[PDB]
Amino acid sequence: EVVIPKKKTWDKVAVLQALASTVNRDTTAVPYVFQDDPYLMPASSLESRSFLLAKKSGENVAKFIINSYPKYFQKDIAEPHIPCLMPEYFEPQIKDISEAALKERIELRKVKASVDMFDQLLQAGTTVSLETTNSLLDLLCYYGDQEPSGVTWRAKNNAERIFSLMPEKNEHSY
Amino acid sequence: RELPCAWKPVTYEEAHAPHYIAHRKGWLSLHTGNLDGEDHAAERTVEDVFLRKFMWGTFPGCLADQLVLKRRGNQLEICAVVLRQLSPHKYYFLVGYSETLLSYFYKCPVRLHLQTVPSKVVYKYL
Amino acid sequence: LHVDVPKDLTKPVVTISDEPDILYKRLSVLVKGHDKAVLDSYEYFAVLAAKE
Amino acid sequence: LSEYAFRMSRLSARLFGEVTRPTNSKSMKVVKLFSELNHHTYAELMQTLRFLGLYR
Amino acid sequence: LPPRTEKMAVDQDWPSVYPVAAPFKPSAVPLPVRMGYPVKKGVPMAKEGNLELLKIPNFLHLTPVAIKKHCEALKDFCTEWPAALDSDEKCEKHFPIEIDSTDYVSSGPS
Amino acid sequence: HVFARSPALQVLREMKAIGIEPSLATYHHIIRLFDQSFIIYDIMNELMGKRFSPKDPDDDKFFQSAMSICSSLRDLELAYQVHGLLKTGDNWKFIGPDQHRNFYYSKFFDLICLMEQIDVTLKWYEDLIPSAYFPHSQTMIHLLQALDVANRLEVIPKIWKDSK
Amino acid sequence: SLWDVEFAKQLATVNEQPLQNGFEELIQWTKEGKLWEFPINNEAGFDDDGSEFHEHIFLEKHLESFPKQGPIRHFMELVTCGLSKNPYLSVKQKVEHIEWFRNYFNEK
Amino acid sequence: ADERLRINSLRRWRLSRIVFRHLADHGQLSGIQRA
Helix, strand or coil: CCCCCEECCCCCCCCHHHHHHCCCCCCCCCCCCCCCCCCCCCCCHHHHHHHHHHHHHHHHHHHHHHHHHHCCCCCCCCCCCCHHCEEEEEECCCCCCCHHCCCCCCHHCCCCHHHHHHHHHHHHHCCCCCCHHHHHHHHHHHCCCCCCCCCCCCCCCCCHHHHHHHCCCCCCCC | CCHHHCCCCHHHHHHHHHHCCCCCCCEEEEECCCCCCCCCCCHHHHHHHHHHHHHHCCCCEEEEECCCCEEEEEEEECEEEEEECCCCHHHHHHHHHHHHHHHHHHHEEEEEEECCCCCCCEEEEC | CCCCCCCCCCCCCCEECCCCCCCCCCCCCCCCCCCCHHHHHHHHHHHHHCCC | CCHHHHHHHHHHHHHCCCCCCCCCCCCHHHHHHHHCHHHHHHHHHHHHHCCCCCCC | CHHHHHHCCCCCCCCHCCCCCCCCHHHHHHHCCCCCCCCCCCCCCCCCCHHHHHHHCCCCCHHHHHHHHHHHHHHHHHCCCCCCCCCCCHHHCCCCCCCCCCCCCCCCCC | CHHHHHHHHHHHHHHCCCHHHHHHHHHHHHHHHHHCCHHHHHHHHCCCCCCCCCCCCHHHHHHHHHHHHHHCCCHHHHHHHHHHHHHHHCHHHHHHHHHHHHHHHHEEEEEEEHHCCCHHHHHHHHHHHHCCCCCCCCHHHHHHHHHHHCCCHHHHHHHHHHHH | CCCHHHHHHHHHCCCCCCCCCCCHHHHHHHCCCCCCCCCCCCCCCCCCCHCCCCHHHHHHHHHHHCCCCCHHHHHHHHHHHHHHCCCCHHHHHHHHHHHHHHHHHHHC | CCHHHHHHHHHCCCHHHHHHHHHHHHHCCCCCCCE
């Protein structure tokens, strides 16, 4: 009689995790993050930190160049597509006077642009939904009217102004 | 003085001539493109060209020899042999920069395996 | 490591499903290379793994 | 060529999806037609990384 | 600085030195291996700075000890052939249809 | 400080009573409020054999603080228990930034040098340096003092080559 | 809200250690999606809009608005026989070809 | 493009010989030997 077994399954990295569990740490090597060349192994803790910060600075320069000139890196050739290797866009795409531009600026966390945009909406006489106002206060209160990189709470700051401006204040805002 | 009176180190890759590529030398680049039945040999060739010019322009006067470009799956390993003349901090900065830039340019996980040498490894003198 | 050893290791999660398993009568693996020695090394590795 | 073989083949064509009606060979070219289907980047990137002080 | 192969013992755990596929490191591989066509009254070149050894797809990460240790941990993932199917005589009896399909492993982004 | 110890124990009892399982950050806070110290033994007896998951931002500060106690109390068995908790499964992720890693290992190895037999001290020395951390000069003086009290003076040249 | 997202990313940091060895690096790249998934599946990340074979092989329901018995039926039967043998196109592109043919023959 | 195909219906390394030669001689094209 044919007893077909059951199809046991595993996560994608499961085999790698097993193979990794097979091997111990190399006691005569510096950590994997450094180079194995004798001239490039850090000798001291300050030297190791210096090398790690140098590597991170190189990474950030590369990322700045990637994000500043996306047109040179937009040509995708990888199948399946890799979103994490694509440029990231940090500018607001909606320019017209609407709650849409406002929510996009809140999504991108552009504090000054968001508050200016809300003032413009108020000038135009367009009513802003309660949820958008709650999002704006969330952003401002977390960041204290400063752009994302301590900050002390300043009196009558834009958070307080917008808060006093809302016709209706619910639990979320308080 | 008078007319009747009158009458260059090379490394292993430089020393040996092109007719030794499978006899004494090897192939600097290793990929499956040129095997019988495989595809995209041209794209891999253009990728290799850009990698070599980019690396020779990003490590000026550091590279002791030619690069070795290995490819497994979608990985891309650059095994380069550089000199100990540039500071190690600059080496780390450039390694990070080049890895990130090439990974975002080829949309694949590129990696770099620098090997420092005290000076050019001369094989013979031609 | 002579003393400092991982006290325990997290084994990956392999679940025994309820569906029936697929059955392969044959599985032919043709490997192509430009080098005979690399193919001999890979053959040794693959055959030893298959035995194990 | 018997009739029996003829539209036995024509039934086989209907089963496998080929052209049932024998459309000679000059007008079958539609079947074959529908059966089938950057220096700027390199140079600009090189020059921009040259200007930023990271290339050559 | 001195190569770390001077600190490697004669009874170390080699698989922990090369866990995965890695390029030849003359400062990590503790072998006096030489490669290169010798010159007249010469010797094959040493490993330090050798580009030819660096061009080899080495199997230092797959030694018999490492392979056995890998294949002992991977047994957890396997199922068993139904023993009733002893030979092709019964594979063609209980399962008349055979489906053949192929996968291709190249190197590249796609 | 001192006035808050029994309120803190009351809060710990309340958390364990109301079904909220304490994290590493909780025991971190308790340990530091008490370290200003036999309570660490009870905490360790609780935590032995457990795997942790990220629940509070301050969890990564635990082992550091815990090792500090083993440094101040001068107890090696507690330090081995703490390191065994660190090595249980994937707990090592909690060791913290580079500064906390160096701090933790520096105290752990200072304690080992002070208290372990010189053979075990040397085994730990070769297992931890340079793979785990880069030793400070003070740790190297401590290793030399351990070799002195062990009268294993023959190893001083190797230790000095390493220090160089 | 933003508070929850930031607290989650702050919880992410608490176990944010550098890579320890090569296997961990491969695991991280596999999770990030940068590395291929083994065993290699040449049709990974592609589903063809969940189409089934009958939507590729039987395209003759899109010829209903054409003439049923003239030479136009013959020509469009040839076109659909070609298109049903096309492994490089999606169903949407095939039906777009058919709709272009409809428009052109409607004008003429 | 597609329109042109429709109206029609109604009716190795990609390098120059030189640049190829340099790379093939320097051993930079994988697999290419000399006879």
